[PDB]
Each structure stands twice: as C-alpha cells, then as structure tokens.
Amino acid sequence: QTLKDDINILLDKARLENQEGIDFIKATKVLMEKNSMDIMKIREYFQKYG
Amino acid sequence: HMEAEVDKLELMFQKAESDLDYIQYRLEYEIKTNHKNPVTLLKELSVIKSRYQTL
8 A cells, every 4th residue: 555655656746747847848938938029129229229 | 112102102193194184185175166366466566666666
C-alpha cells in the first residue's frame, strides 16, 4: 500500500513538473511578445525621435 | 535387553514418520481437491519495487 502511495505520489510530482514546465514556456513566450514590441517601439523611436 | 529397548525406540520413530507422512498426505489431498499464490507475488513485488526507483 505504502508502495502504491509513493509510486502514485511521484507520478503526481511528474505530472506537475511537466505542467509547471509546459506553462512557463508559454508564460515566457508572452513576455517575449511584450518585450519584442517594447524594443520595436524603442527602436522606431530612436531612429526618428518624433 | 537394551537392544529390546532400542527396538522399541526405532519402532516409535517409524511411527512418528508415518504419522508425519499422513498429515502431509492429507494436506496434499485437501490441496488437490480445491481448484495467485505468494510465490509469484514476491517476484512481482521486486519488479515493481525496482522500476519505481529506476523511474
């Protein structure tokens, strides 16, 4: 029983780490789009200034 | 004399043996007449208790 607990318990930590992972990459890939505009907005600015 | 006593002792042992032999014979009979087991259960429990630590 205790063995089926551990073997279950572990499976849980892995279900998670695949998750806590599978949305980081997307949670990071949204700050990417934000920092990608924020440069392109800074770049478009410094070329002209106005 | 003592030889006679020993003849008895030997006789008793022989009985004890066929006593034991019967008890066994019966258990085997009750066993045959009905239809898992702990034997393969141990092998299975080592296969799991292993690939748990591997995984």
